[model samples]
Target: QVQLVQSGTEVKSPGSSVKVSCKASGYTFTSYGISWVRQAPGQGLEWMGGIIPIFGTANYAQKFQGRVTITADESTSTAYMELSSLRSEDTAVYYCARAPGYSNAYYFDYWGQGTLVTVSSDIQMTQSPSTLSASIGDRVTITCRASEGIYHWLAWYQQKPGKAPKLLIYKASSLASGAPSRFSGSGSGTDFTLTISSLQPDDFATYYCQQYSNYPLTFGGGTKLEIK
Candidate 1:
């Protein structure tokens, strides 16, 4: 029953700044940390960092080190992030997710609906087939294209209903520890694909692609794989 409710969309201009809020409910807000994720228009996902609401301690991804600030208010059970010097490339949907514990892993158990921050200035990531239907034992694939070169710094994630996003593939094609071999990732630069050799009931979930090679990490809209 845990939920993360995020603020609404915001339209800003280049050089301006914006603040997004994520109000947590149905659980203890300060008991777990809240991490920030980003997805530029049609692009993949990016990890901006997270903060421990109880301790007021924060850690950020190297790329967002100085450009982003995270804060929380215990009185209101809300978490917030502010991005400064926004630019065309900074336009993206930002999400706040609950981190299970104190770790740097990409295990976001519960996520906010997302706050779309549009910097009227410019930019994007592309993913195919907003939704997909398939049967068990079938092979399936999802594709994503970066707006610019992102080399091999891409990752793929799997999210089941009411669960945090799980890391499936990282560094474009390397399977994460304990990830099933059935899931594979390939391609580099601007084009990439994630494949499921044989699907299972559990495979019917949403898949997302993210790019970490550049600043303002971004995520593809996602492909929802459903039962046929």
Candidate 2:
């Protein structure tokens, strides 16, 4: 079976840095790019960025520009990401994933186990109300939990009363350009999430988190709100 083994927990002081590794086995590492995700303590998942081992190219969410750096070593079949200028806000679990395919950029087909990084000695932010904050240039994650089995066709949609859900993320979290700079996605298998960071004012829309990680599509209860 395919598996993504990741490094263990890391403790770092504010203003310092840390790096995590995700090693791929049972699949072709060069066949797909490795995606990085963020999850603050007790919060939802966030899309930080991704690195394509085949080309040594990387893409990141605009919000992560100064704080994150993603890299990989095709020779060892391992992908790595480093977080700099660590702060309490940066304390979270980081994940590495194998994107579906060249044609499946937005959708995540495989995933790494997950690594936890703890950053203390800094100011922490309170949880914002559940709202839609995805912009054209952001990275995001929407998690869908199911009882069991794989769905294989998880899709994302925007919801509003009296209106049908708009398809925003298909396969995973690929945005339909004109979408936003902060929009991106990564997740797969039985459990998944769609994320959008640094949401813009115009991006305020009821975001629906869904998944097709298995046979029956599932979604987290619901996180709703407009841009703040």
Candidate 3:
């Protein structure tokens, strides 16, 4: 079956850096790009960035700029991403994703086994909190775990039909700068959240969670918000 086998978990101390790899099998690696994503313990997903295997180009979420780097070796059908200046906050699973094509709206249809990174001298970062929730106006977060880290954080796209998914949040929930004022984000260490206060009528579509975390770009099952 098509699969993305990642390297393995990494144990490192703060201030140090680590590089992980993703090997693509069961498909043509050169025909697709590899993306990276980060998941803190118990947090929502964050889009790190992506690397194109064909052209050797990379795009990073604004928050990940300078914090992470993505590269690929097409000859070996493998991709790599490195995290720099590691901190406790950086301790989390990373993943690599494969995209059908290097397009903005491309959906991650597959994912790889995740790699864990323990960033402490004593405690190991636990599996991230599952089923994270946030209130209206409160920040919300989620995470996508990986075995050996290397993936991409696709843009945060809104999920309403007839309306192309708009980039609401990207990188680390910076609001895409011009995004409406009600949206906000918080929590980086293992747990994160994205909040939209005063849901507008246009916001009725189900919210989807996606990660360029690894080859075969992937997405959470999706969370549909209902007014309680």
> How close is each model in CA RMSD to the real structure?
7.0, 14.8, 12.9
Candidate 2 local lDDT, residue 220: 42
Q: Write the per-residue lDDT of candidate 1 for residues 127-195, one digit (tens) a residue.
A: 898899999999999999988888887878897754447778888899876689999999989999999
Candidate 3 positional error at 119, Å: 1.4
lDDT of candidate 2 over 6-90, digit per residue (tens): 8999999999999999988887888887777665535455667777778777777666665788888888988888988988888
TM-score, structure 3 vs. true: 0.55
Instruction: Estimate, for each residue in 68-142, the C-alpha lDDT of model 3 and write its tens digit.
Output: 888888888888889988888777778676756765234444456677888872111122333334344444443
> Which candidate would rank higher by TM-score, 1 or 2?
1
The candidate 2 region of ten consecutive residues with least summed lDDT is 121-130
Q: Which parts of model 2 have CA positions greater than 4 angstroms off? A: 41-43, 103-105, 121-228
Which should have the higher TM-score, number 1 or number 3?
1
TM-score, per-candidate, Cα-based? 0.62, 0.56, 0.55
lDDT of each: 0.80, 0.61, 0.60
Lowest-scoring 10 consecutive residues by lDDT in candidate 1?
100-109
Q: What is the lDDT of residue 132 in candidate 1?
A: 98
TM-score of 1: 0.62
lDDT of 3 at 189: 33
At residue 212, candidate 3 shows an lDDT of 37
